[PDB]
Amino acid sequence: VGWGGSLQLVADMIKMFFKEDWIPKFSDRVIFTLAPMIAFTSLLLAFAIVPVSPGWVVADLNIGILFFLMMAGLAVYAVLFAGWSSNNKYSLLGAMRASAQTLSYEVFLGLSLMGVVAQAGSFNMTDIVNSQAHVWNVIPQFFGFITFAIAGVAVCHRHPFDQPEAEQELADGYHIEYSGMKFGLFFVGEYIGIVTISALMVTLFFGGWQGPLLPPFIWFALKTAFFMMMFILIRASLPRPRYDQVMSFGWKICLPLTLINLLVTAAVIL
């Protein structure tokens, strides 16, 4: 039998290939094709800002954070052009409510990231990864860390659990009218999304490239693997939250939390 956990995703990707494609009648064609890559290429190029090595850095640009926020904002268009391209009021309203909770829960990540980039004081990721040399930026900002976790798992990562189903009747999940390779494009997109959120968490909150007694790139890789396993553990443990409870614990609870977080870091930094 297959001994590797990743081999299942490999077989899934192989399976999605070479599947006959049917044309949908009474549907738009340009957005039916373009909506997958707005979800895929966005988090693919979100991988372009990781400091995997000082000598093998994929991009030595001065700003990577703003690019990440630009991808976070862009991601909604995939669910929206998918909703309009569904051309079925059921699926359209399902993608409208999914994009609703998406835009609702995408607010927090920028303001939560302001704390760490303020105690870091720079946008070049070499400065952040060199800042966590002796003390990591996780001890004071517990609330910011959990807020960034919730925001990262809330962007169409299935934690809301309203993507393939709908609590409200008269409407249906928007993953029904896609049955070709686009469904595999969605899965691979959320896969690169979760691994990139984990990588950004380790290299921006914790200390990347430390190397206490072993080479630091495998130290980063193993820490990323442990946080991957913990993310999967809590994703599985996390039960489906109905739409209402998600709306209740959205703008009410974490906007004040991040605002007092900025107040605390600004008061203690000087």
């Binding site: 189903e165 409200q168 009747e169 008269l170 039960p239």
Partner: protein
């Protein structure tokens, strides 16, 4: 004996009806149903029913309404000359009595005034009578076919209609193309009931057919929407028709027993109990005590399993499903005991006419004792987990509530009717299968029937069932597992293997079938859902002449439109989950 054929002419209701109407019109039949069967020409039906409805102790609930063919009965001593008949079984709860009324009809004038005005739950029953037979009920609001499709020609419960599919043409797809054209042209003519509202922007027609889980089968409930309100809900049932009633006519008394197991998938031996009791009532067999205690054990085990499934599904659909999935593991242990006794996890087919298939294996007591000592702590953990919870409790109060009158008119029995103040179980009012030698209580909801009261009552019934099961473990008597009577089918097998007369009895009983003399029996029990009954008529042959299975789920699914009118779709789905309806039971 409790099986001898009585007329019940001395009964007070017969003398009150004799005083009011004097002589004539009434022919008091002699039967083994336990109730008084009276024939009343169709021109007096409504007067008699109205008088009975207002009598100083009234017959508040119409238990059953259906028809009989009656054309091929050679033994017809005392009955009026009939080519068709329609029977109406009524029940007085304050009298704990029943009455059966039979209207005779001729083949040219199959017409009787509709009875729905007095009891609304008869409406679908009369529609069913139009579908399966050809009696037209004048005054019916929407007299369309409720079981077969709308183009199905023929009335399948007539004896001139060939029963088996082999006599018709196979699925050659001649009709698949026409059904495809019909489904593609999905339009509403407004003939699906009154449909007073017009098809425009004001009213939206939505099939709303739940194919998601916990739906208890795929069905459609056409819904008229206005302001996201339930303007009118019309169920489209009959998808799961298995022809059990027609199947009962072409099977022997012994070989029908497997078909009983599939009226309710969760019932098992509960579904077998009324059939074997009715057949033994036709045979005039009094069973030993051990048969009674064994039957009580199997029926309380299956009732416990069904109640645990209802509790689990209720906590899962409107609440947190993480802890209660352990009840699935507990249900698995109940299965190892059933297949330890009967042989197979579901559909045991273990009850026989006069007894059971085998004796209990010698290690039954230790397993039952281990289940009885282990279970109470888990049951009290669920009791705290369900009585004390607040979120669904707060949500599940006053949600589509009804009272005693509302339950009575809609024929609703079971936890629904026990949730009101009427203390009425059939296991206490009409003891059967030796329940009268046990000490147990009937929980009651007070005066308000809702979903919380129903689940609390189901938990209390599970506790009473566990007390019955320990009393069965501690007071299981000794002796045979089969009655000693020539109509006990089959004979004890070790006697069959050695003795010639027992071998001959077994030969003719399993090959041609047992010959039951021509009479009519009727038994009702408390089932896993509501009250389930069997009305059997034999014409003296080795097969049933008429088998009627009254299932409460038909009434429970008929009841939804009266209460949900004025609610949201979410309340509809919650009610559908709450109500104890299974498609197999509704469509038999």
């Amino acid at each position: 004996p409790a099986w001898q054929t009585r007329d019940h002419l001395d009964d007070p209701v017969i003398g009150e009806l004799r005083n009011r109407f004097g002589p004539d019109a009434f022919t008091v039949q002699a039967t083994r149903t336990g109730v008084p069967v009276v024939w009343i020409k169709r021109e007096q039906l409504l007067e008699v029913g109205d008088f009975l409805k207002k009598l100083p102790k009234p017959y508040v609930m119409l238990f059953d309404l259906h028809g009989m063919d009656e054309r091929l009965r050679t033994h017809r001593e005392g009955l009026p000359a009939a080519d068709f008949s329609v029977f109406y079984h009524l029940i007085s709860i304050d009298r704990n009595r029943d009455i059966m009324l039979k209207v005779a009809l001729a083949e040219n004038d199959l017409h009787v005034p509709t009875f729905t005005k007095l009891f609304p739950n008869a409406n679908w029953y009369e529609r069913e009578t139009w579908d399966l037979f050809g009696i037209t009920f004048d005054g019916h609001p929407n007299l369309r076919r409720i079981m077969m499709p709308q183009t199905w020609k023929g009335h399948p419960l007539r004896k001139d209609y060939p029963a088996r599919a082999t006599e018709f043409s196979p699925f050659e797809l001649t009709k698949a193309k026409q059904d495809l054209e019909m489904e593609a042209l999905t339009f509403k003519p407004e003939e699906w009931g009154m449909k007073r509202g017009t098809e425009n922007e004001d009213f939206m027609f939505l099939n709303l057919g739940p194919n998601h889980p916990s739906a208890h089968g795929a069905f459609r409930i056409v819904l008229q929407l206005d302001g996201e309100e339930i303007v009118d809900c019309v169920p489209d049932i009959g998808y799961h028709h298995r022809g059990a009633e027609k199947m009962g006519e072409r099977q022997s008394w012994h070989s029908y027993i497997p078909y009983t197991d599939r009226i309710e998938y969760l019932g098992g031996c509960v579904n077998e109990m009324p059939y074997v009791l009715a057949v033994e009532k036709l045979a005039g067999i009094t069973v030993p005590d051990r048969v009674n205690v064994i039957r009580v054990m199997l029926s309380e085990l299956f009732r416990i399993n069904s109640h645990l499934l209802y509790i689990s599904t209720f906590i899962q659909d409107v609440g947190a499903m993480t802890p209660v999935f352990f009840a699935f593991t507990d249900r698995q242990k109940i299965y190892d005991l059933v297949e330890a006794i009967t042989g197979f996890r579901m559909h045991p087919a273990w009850f026989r006419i006069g007894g059971v298939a085998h004796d209990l294996p010698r290690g039954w007591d230790r397993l039952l004792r281990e289940f009885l000592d282990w279970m109470p702590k888990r049951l009290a953990s669920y009791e705290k987990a369900a009585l004390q919870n607040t979120i669904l409790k707060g949500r599940s109060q006053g949600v589509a509530a009804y009272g005693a009158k509302e339950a009575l008119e809609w024929g609703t029995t079971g936890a629904g009717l026990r949730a009101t103040g009427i203390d009425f179980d059939v296991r206490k009012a009409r003891p059967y299968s030796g329940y009268e030698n046990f000490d147990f209580e009937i929980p009651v909801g007070g005066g308000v029937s809702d979903c919380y009261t129903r689940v609390m009552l189901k938990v209390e019934e599970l506790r009473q069932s566990l007390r019955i099961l320990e009393q069965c473990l501690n007071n299981m008597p000794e002796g045979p597992f089969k009655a000693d009577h020539p109509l006990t089918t089959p004979p004890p097998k070790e006697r069959t293997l050695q003795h010639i007369e027992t071998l001959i009895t077994h030969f003719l009983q399993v090959s041609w079938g047992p010959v039951m003399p021509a009479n009519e029996s009727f038994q009702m029990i408390e089932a896993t859902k509501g009250i389930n009954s069997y009305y059997l008529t034999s014409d003296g042959s080795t097969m049933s002449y008429r088998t009627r299975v009254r299932t409460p789920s038909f009434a429970h699914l008929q009841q939804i439109p009266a209460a949900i009118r004025g609610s949201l779709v979410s309340d509809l789905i919650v009610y559908l989950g709450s109500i104890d309806f299974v498609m197999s039971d509704v469509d038999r």
